[PDB]
Amino acid sequence: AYACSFPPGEIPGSKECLAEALQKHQGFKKKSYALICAYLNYKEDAENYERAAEDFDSAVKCTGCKEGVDLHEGNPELIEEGFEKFLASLKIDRKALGSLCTLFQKLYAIPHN
Amino acid sequence: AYACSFPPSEIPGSKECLAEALQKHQGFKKKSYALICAYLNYKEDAENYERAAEDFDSAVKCTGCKEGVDLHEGNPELIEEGFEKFLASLKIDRKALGSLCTLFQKLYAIPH
Ligand SMILES: [Zn+2]
Numbered sequence: 101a102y103a104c105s106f107p108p109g110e111i112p113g114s115k116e117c118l119a120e121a122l123q124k125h126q127g128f129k130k131k132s133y134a135l136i137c138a139y140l141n142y143k144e145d146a147e148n149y150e151r152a153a154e155d156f157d158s159a160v161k162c163t164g165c166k167e168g169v170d171l172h173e174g175n176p177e178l179i180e181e182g183f184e185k186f187l188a189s190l191k192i193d194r195k196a197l198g199s200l201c202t203l204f205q206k207l208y209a210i211p212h213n
Numbered sequence: 214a215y216a217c218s219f220p221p222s223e224i225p226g227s228k229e230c231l232a233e234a235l236q237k238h239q240g241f242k243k244k245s246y247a248l249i250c251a252y253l254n255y256k257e258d259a260e261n262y263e264r265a266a267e268d269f270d271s272a273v274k275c276t277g278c279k280e281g282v283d284l285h286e287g288n289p290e291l292i293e294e295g296f297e298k299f300l301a302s303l304k305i306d307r308k309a310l311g312s313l314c315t316l317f318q319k320l321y322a323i324p325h
Contacts, residue, residue, distance in 0.1 A: 137316075137317070137319075141319065145319060148318075198311065203250075203254065204317065205247045205261075208323060210247060211214050211216060
């Protein structure tokens with residue numbers, strides 16, 4: 101699930117659409133970094149990844165970006181491919197994934213209001 | 214801050230009190246693993262660490278454990294020793310830091 105916390109992109113056709121949504125909209129960043137953390141523990145908890153992927157799928161629909169990101173989150177043979185697609189599409193530094201997961205804590209502070 | 218979400222320990226005098234609270238209570242895992250994530254990023258955001266440490270301190274009060282874990286969270290020269298005290302007290306292997314931080318996401322589900 102993801103209730104849209106931000107409006108549609110003004111650059112839906114841009115190769116930067118998803119990367120810019122990530123930067124500008126904390127809620128999309130939270131779901132994206134949550135997904136990275138879930139990926140890193142996929143082999144011990146596939147259901148958590150599946151839920152995080154569904155949440156991300158929900159949040160991506162908010163963006164209006166044209167670029168499709170099929171995570172194939174229920175298909176073990178395609179999990180890696182789908183996650184790499186996500187990284188490519190969002191223009192994430194793929195050598196920094198550990199760090200980005202660790203930032204989920206900063207982006208989703210507790211307690212909060 | 215931390216709004217106590219679990220009951221205080223049955224073994225407040227024990228050297229195992231904090232490790233036992235961590236084992237039993239998700240809320241204490243949440244604040245502990247959040248602290249770990251904040252520590253891993255200390256060198257780029259000390260304020261976030263200070264806040265997470267204060268939150269952890271508050272969660273420690275909720276446990277009722279007598280043992281102290283002084284994180285020295287405002288003192289750069291002592292952050293390392295404070296965090297090592299945290300690891301020793303909660304019986305967390307330093308090799309496990311990355312994994313435990315990554316688990317904050319699983320233990321703090323969004324949306325909610
Ligand atoms: Zn929350």
